[PDB]
Amino acid sequence: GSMALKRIHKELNDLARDPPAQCSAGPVGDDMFHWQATIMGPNDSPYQGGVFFLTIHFPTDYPFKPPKVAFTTRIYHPNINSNGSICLDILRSQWSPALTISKVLLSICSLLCDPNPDDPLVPEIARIYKTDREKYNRIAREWTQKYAM
Template identity: 30%
Template structure:
């Protein structure tokens, strides 16, 4: 590359993909070399596409900022069970440690649920780095697994044996009708569509 000069790399972010550009000038025909770098954002781009293609019919994904694919809201609208008629928002944040660590999930809608605290903490095995039942997070898990897991908290994944909201679990065990009534009160007050 005698007499050639390299212009330093510049970074350009487009649609969640980071691209490095390098232009070689003087002594060569102007040429551009575009190198795609697989970063967390690049990986997330494909995980988000896959997640959106396999969404349960009761779920919707909302991106407040389409350039921040690692932060989004999952909206769950149960069509059966105790929470039918509600619209529940979960903030999902994919950390830099993803795939080695699970995304962070927080319920943004106040509700009465044995596995979700009134502060929004979510008790779901696959969101734990390690869990007693062996179903915790693993690098092979995907964002779609998180979506399906959160959705299942409103149908078949209720866990009354290891609840986050003990009061809700105890009420369910001693008086299912009072539990149903309290759930409906919360849905009406905080989660109406």
């Protein structure tokens, strides 16, 4: 039907033959515009062994507009809301039709490995992240242990 739908389906096929490293995604039921993603916690992070779930909402004009991505699993991170809302450039103003869910997930993993405190979504976690790195790592591990695994 639409170009967005064909895009989402070819993208789904590319994901079923070349899945991103440490990541997977797919349709929640029969709707193609509603996906669920899974990111297993990166090893270069206090998020290890944890399995994190995300929701993905594709816009009606999708490849020309960014996907709404949010965490389902609770997580202790400077750029991630308590609503699971993500502060990521490529999901807002650095978006482009070239970017794909594969690239978005990979980018989110990179965001878990190396947060951006300069543009915090949780001010306090960012402040702790650039004053008490031990406290940050510690709490991150704990929250990784009570919600992820």
